[PDB]
Symmetry: D2
C-alpha cells in the first residue's frame, strides 16, 4: 500500500525490513546507509542473531533485489539529500541513531516524505507512541515526526497499563537486564557514558535509561511514579524488564498473574504475552510481541509490593511495532 | 594458629586458601577433593579468573607444597573417612557443595574436627553467620556446624542493616545479576532447576534465590520483609545486588548515600565499601569486601521508595569472609 | 520402519532424534537418560543452540509425546537393564559418552538390541564408519558394535579423500577450531586433560584429538600421513577444520577448489558441501552436511602445499550422519 | 630521557604507556585522542582486560596526572596540528589505526617530531622492524617513519627465524586463532571485510592477514615461503600462532623443541619464550614477551613436516616491543 523508506539499514533497519515483508499495508522501496548494495545485501542475507533470511536476496548493479522486487539503495550521510518525494516515499523509518532530534528528522519531510517514525526516544517529537497503549492519541493532521519510543518502554508500558488500571500504581522502580547493542564498545573506547565505554561482552554494565520515565509519555497517569536503570550484559539479543512496584489495591500473586494473562489474551493480544514456562533469554530470540510476562517470577509482599518480570526481543518486537505503527498511521490518511 | 582443613578444593575452596595465606590466625594443612595432588596443584597455580597465584606451588609426591609448606592432599568422597583428628585439624571449611545438610557436615566432627564452616546456605545448621552483621550471636559452646550463608546474602545484609537501622525497612525486593557458577551447565543438561539446565554462557537466566529471605537469619527484624530472585548472566565472576525498598523515614538520595558511606568508613569498614565511580563488573574482580555500594545508582521516589545497588566478587569477598569467620570462631575458644 | 533407541538424550541424542523425524525409514521408540520425562521433554522443546522444536511436545504419564507420537522414557544408568529386545529396539545409538569401549557398548546387545552405533571414536569396535567414505566396509554378519567416529573426522575425511585420490597426499597436519562441548568445564574443575579443566567460555583452549589419525581408519591409504590438534573456543556450536597438506601433484588454488566443488556436487553430494561465500560460524548452525569447504580460504604455495578450511555444525551434521548410518545398517538386514 | 608522544591512546596506546613506565630511558610527555582528559584518565585507570592501573591517576586542569607526573592531553584529529616539536617530542607512536600510510604518518614529522613508529603493518614506511629479528637494519640517517609490524608477525618471526637458521624452511602456512579487536563489529555492521562485519563475540571469524608474508620483510630469506590466515574468536585478548612447515633437515619433536628452548634462553631471551606447561589463553594475559612456544603442542611427521604453536598477548607483548624499539631508536641518535 504505502511506500516506505528506511534510513539506517542496521539492526532495527534490517529487522523492520523483515517485518515489513509480512505486512501487506507497507512496502519498502528504498533504504539508505553508508555502504554499497553488495554489503547491505550480504548483511540482510546472513544475520548473526536471527539466521539466514528466508527470502530471495541478490544485487542488481546498484540496488537490492528481494523476492523479485527491487529496493533502491542510497548512500547519503545527509538526510536532506534523500529525495524521498522523487520515489514516492510517504513514510520514513529513521533508524540511524543520529537523527533523534526533530530538527534533524524533519529533514526527511523536506526531502519529500510525509511522515517520519524515529525508532527511538526523540527530542521535540510531535508525539511518542507505544502500540497497544496510546496510538489513539495520534493526530494525522498535527503529528508528522513520531517516536516509537525505546523497546524497553515498549516492554514496560503494556503491563504497566494493566497493573495501573486494575490495581493502581503508587510508585515503582525497574531495571532492565538488556543485551548489548551497537551503541556500546568492543574494547574500552571513549563514549559519553563511561559505563558504555567498557568492553561489552566482558562485563555487567549498569547504565542510565529513561524507559521508566518515558512511560508517562504514553501513560500520563504514571507521570513521576516510575524510574529505572539498565544493566547491559554479554548476550547479543533479547532483554528483560524487572519491575518492583507498590500497588494501591491489596492483591495476591494469583490475581496479578490472572489480570496480566487476561489482558494478554484480550485487548493486548499480540502486544503482551503471558508465559508460565521456565525459559531463558535464548528462548525469546525471534519473539514478535513487545512484552512477555514471566509468570513464574511474579512475586508479592504484604499484598502491596509486586515484582513483575517481562521478556522482550529488543530487535524483533520493536521492529514489528515500528511496522504496525507505519500501517496504523497510514490507515489514518497521509 | 588454628589448623584448618578444606573439603572441596574448588572455586571457593581454592579462593579460601588464597585468603588464608594472608591470615596469621589460620593455617591450611590439608585439602580434600576427588583428584590427584598434581591436578590440584595445577589448578591452584593457574586460575582462569584471578590469574596466576603469587606463591611457590609444586607437588611433593602425594602432597602440595606452597611457599615451602606442605599441604596434605586427600581424595575421600566420604567425609566420614577424612580423619581430621589425626592431623590436628580443628576447623573444616565444607565447600564441596554436597554436604550443606548438618547430618552430612557433622561427619567432619565425627572425623575429629571441632568446628565446621559450611560455605553456603545450610539445612539444620547450628547458626548462620554474616560477618559484620551477627557474628556476635555465635556461641562457642553450642555452635559447631556453622553456615557462612551465600555470597549474595553477604552482599545484601550489610547495607540492609544500615538502611533498616537508619531509616527502617517496611518491605523490599531484590534481584542479583550474578555471574554463572559451577552449579550451572555448559550446554542444556538435566538439572533440578530447569532454568539452570540451560547453556550458562548463552543466556540471561532467571533463577530462585533465598538470599533475601536468609537476611532474616542474621537480621531478625527483617523477617518476612524481603524477597528476591537472581538472573545468571554470561560473566565468569562478580555479581551485583539490586534492592528496591520502601522506607519508613522520608529521605533523599543524598542522605541515603551519606549513611551508606559513613557505615562503610565506620563500623563496617572492610565489609561494606562505597564507590562514586562509574565502574563495571570486571572492575570488581579480586575485590575482598562483601559489598560495595554503587553510589551513582542510588535512586529515590516520593522520598520513600529507594533503589540501592551493590557489587560483590562472589568468589573473593565470600572466601575472605569464610577466613574471617574461621579466625573469629578460633578467638572464642575451640 | 526400523525401531531405534537412543541412550544418552543429550546434545547428540536430541539432535539425532530431530534428524530421525525426517527419515520415515527409522522410528525412535525410546530414549534413556538419568532424569525424568518432564525434564527431557523440556530440554527437547527449548534448545539454547537450535531454537524451539517445531513440533507438539507433552508428557503423557512418564513418557514423552512428540506430535502425538509417544516415546518411551527410560532412566537406567546401567545399559544391561535397558531391555531393548522387550520393546523391539533393533538399533541403539550410544550417545552417553560413557560407553565408548566395546565391553560397555556390547551391553545393549545383551539387552536385546541387534546393533549399536557408538556416537564417538571407540575402543575395540567392530568397525568405524564415515558415511560417504567407507560405509561399504560395513559387514552385517560380523559388525554389531559400530562407531560413527567423531564430528571432526566426519568433516576431514570426505575432503581428505578427494585430495588424496585427485592429487595424492604426502602428509598433512590439521587443527580444528572447535566450539566448546559438555566434556569441558564451566569454571576450572578437575579433568584428565588439564587443558579442558579450564573455564570453557573464557579461553582459547589447545587440546589433543585423534581425529587426524582416525581418518586412517576410513582411509587406510592415509595411515601415518596425518596428525593434528584442536583448539576449543568460546562458541556454543559449529567448528571448522584447517588442513595444511603436502600434495604429490603440482596444483593451483583453482584446481584444488574445482576438485572439491566437483565432488560436492557429485559423489559426495549431501556429505561434502562447497561455499564461495565469506561466512562465519553462526551461519552454519543447523547445517546438515558433514563438511562445507570455505573456498575463499583455499591457499597454495609452490603448487605443492595447500590449505583447505571446512565448516561443520558439530552437533547437527554428525547427528544426521548417525541417522543415515542407522538406515544404512537396517537396509543391510538385521 | 627521550620524550615520547602517543597518538591514539587506545588498546595499544595505553598499553604502551604502561610499558613505558618501566623504562627510565623513555618518557611519555603527551598523548592525543578524540576525547577529554577526564575520559582518557578513566580508561587508563580501569581496564576491562588488564585490571586497575597500579598508580595514582587524576585530572589536573585539562591534563592527566599519573603518579604525580603530568601528561599533556591533546584532542587533534589532524596530525599536522599536534605541534610535537613545540613540546620537545622526538618520537611519536602512531597507534590510531588511521595513519598507517607514510603520507599520513609523516605529518607527525611535519609537526616537529623526529621519528614515527607506526604500531601496525604500514604502507611505504622507510622500514619495518621486529625486535630481536632485524633491528640492526634500522638506519638513523634514512629511516624516519618506522613500522613495528603486527603483533602476529612479532610472534611468528622470532621462532620462524630459529626454524629456518637451524633446519631450513622450505615452505609453511600459518593460522592465528586471534582474540577480537576494535577493528571488528559488535553486531553485524558495514565493514570492508564482510567477515569482520559480523558479531565479534558470537562467531569464529575467518579473516585474511599479511602477517605470514610480512615475515619476509624482516626475514628476506623467507620471501615467498610463507602465507596464512587468521580466525578471530570470542575472547577479549591473547592469541596464538599455529605454524605448519616443511623443513629441509630431518628432525624429531625433541630436536625442534630443544632448538626453540635454546633460542629462548639464549639469543632471543625476552623476545621468545618456551613453555612445557599445558596452559590456556587466559594464562598469557599480561605476557610481555613477543612469543611463547607451547612445547606440548610440537608435532612432527616423516621428520620433515612440523607444527609449532606459540602464544602471544597481542596488546601487551607488542606494546612492550614498541617501547623497546623507541629506546633502540633513541640510542641510535636523533
Ligand atoms: N538495537 C536495539 O536493541 C534497539 C531497539 C529499539 C530501538 N533502537 C534504536 O534504533 C536506532 C538504531 O539502532 P541499531 O541498533 O539498529 O543501530 P546500528 O548501528 O545497528 O544501525 C545503524 C545503521 O545506520 C547507519 N548510519 C549511520 N549514520 C548514517 C547516516 N548518516 N545515514 C545513513 N545511514 C547511517 C549505519 O551504517 C548502520 O547500518 C537507535 O536510535 C537505537 O537507540 C535500538
Ligand atoms: N562460586 C560462587 O560464587 C560461590 C559463592 C559462595 C558460596 N558458594 C558455595 O560454595 C560451595 C562450593 O561452590 P564452588 O563454586 O566452589 O564449586 P566447585 O564445583 O567449583 O568446587 C567444588 C569442589 O569440591 C569437589 N568435590 C565434590 N564432591 C566432593 C566430595 N565428595 N569430596 C571431596 N571433594 C568433592 C569438586 O571436585 C570441586 O573441586 C557450594 O555450596 C556453593 O553454593 C559458591
Ligand atoms: N557435542 C558434539 O559436538 C559431539 C559431536 C559428535 C560426537 N560427540 C560424542 O557423543 C557423545 C555425547 O556427547 P554430547 O555432547 O551429546 O554429551 P552430553 O553431555 O550433552 O549428553 C550426554 C547425555 O547422556 C546422559 N548420560 C550420562 N550417563 C548416562 C548413563 N550412564 N545412562 C544414560 N544416560 C546417561 C546425560 O544425562 C546426557 O543427557 C560423546 O561420546 C561425544 O564425544 C559429541
Ligand atoms: N589490538 C591489538 O591486538 C593490536 C596489536 C598490535 C597492533 N595493533 C594496531 O595498532 C593500531 C590501534 O589498535 P587498537 O586496538 O589500539 O585500536 P583502538 O581502536 O583501541 O585505539 C585507537 C585509538 O585512537 C583514537 N583515534 C582514532 N582516530 C584518531 C585520530 N584521528 N586522532 C587521534 N586519535 C584517534 C581512538 O579514539 C582510540 O582511542 C592499529 O593500527 C592496529 O592494527 C593492534
Ligand atoms: O532496547 C532498548 C533501547 O531501545 C536500546 O538503545 P541503544 O541503541 O542505546 O542500545
Ligand atoms: O553467590 C551466590 C551463591 O553463593 C551462589 O551459589 P551457586 O553455587 O548455586 O551458584
Ligand atoms: O567434534 C569433535 C568431537 O566429537 C568432540 O568430542 P568431546 O565430546 O570429547 O568434546
Ligand atoms: O595482532 C594482529 C594485528 O595486530 C591485528 O590488527 P587489527 O587491529 O587490524 O585487528
Amino acid at each position: 500500500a504505502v511506500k516506505v523508506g528506511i534510513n539506517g539499514f542496521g539492526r532495527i533497519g534490517r529487522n523492520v525490513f523483515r517485518a515489513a515483508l509480512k505486512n501487506p499495508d507497507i512496502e519498502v522501496v528504498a533504504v539508505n546507509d553508508l555502504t554499497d548494495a553488495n554489503t547491505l545485501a550480504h548483511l540482510l542475507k546472513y544475520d548473526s542473531v536471527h539466521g539466514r533470511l528466508d527470502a530471495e536476496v541478490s544485487v542488481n548493479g546498484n540496488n537490492l533485489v528481494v523476492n523479485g522486487k527491487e529496493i533502491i539503495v542510497k548512500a547519503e550521510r545527509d538526510p536532506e539529500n534523500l529525495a524521498w518525494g522523487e520515489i514516492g516515499v510517504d513514510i520514513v523509518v529513521e533508524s540511524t541513531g543520529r537523527f533523534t532530534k526533530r530538527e534533524d528528522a524533519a529533514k526527511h519531510l523536506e526531502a519529500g516524505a510525509k511522515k517520519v517514525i524515529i525508532s527511538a526516544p526523540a527530542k521535540n517529537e510531535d508525539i511518542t507512541i507505544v502500540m497497544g497503549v496510546n496510538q489513539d492519541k495520534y493526530d494525522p493532521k498535527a503529528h508528522h515526526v513520531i517516536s516509537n519510543a525505546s523497546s524497553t518502554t515498549n516492554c514496560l508500558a503494556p503491563f504497566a497499563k494493566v497493573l495501573h488500571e486494575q490495581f493502581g500504581i503508587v510508585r515503582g522502580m525497574m531495571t532492565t537486564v538488556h543485551s548489548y547493542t551497537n551503541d556500546q564498545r568492543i574494547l574500552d573506547l571513549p563514549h559519553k557514558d563511561l559505563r558504555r565505554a567498557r568492553a561489552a561482552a566482558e562485563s555487567i554494565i549498569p547504565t542510565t535509561t529513561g524507559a521508566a520515565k518515558a512511560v508517562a509519555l504514553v501513560l500520563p497517569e504514571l507521570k513521576g511514579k516510575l524510574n529505572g536503570m539498565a544493566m547491559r550484559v554479554p548476550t547479543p539479543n533479547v532483554s528483560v524488564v524487572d519491575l518492583v512496584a507498590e500497588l494501591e489495591k491489596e492483591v495476591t500473586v494469583e490475581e496479578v498473574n490472572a489480570a496480566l494473562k487476561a489482558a494478554a489474551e484480550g485487548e493486548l493480544k499480540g502486544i503482551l504475552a503471558y508465559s508460565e514456562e521456565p525459559l531463558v533469554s535464548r528462548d525469546y530470540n525471534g519473539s514478535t510481541v513487545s512484552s512477555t510476562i514471566d509468570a513464574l517470577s511474579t512475586m508479592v509482599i504484604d499484598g502491596k509490593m509486586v515484582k513483575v518480570v517481562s521478556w522482550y526481543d529488543n530487535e524483533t518486537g520493536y521492529s514489528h511495532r515500528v511496522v504496525d505503527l507505519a500501517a496504523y498511521i497510514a490507515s489514518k490518511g497521509l
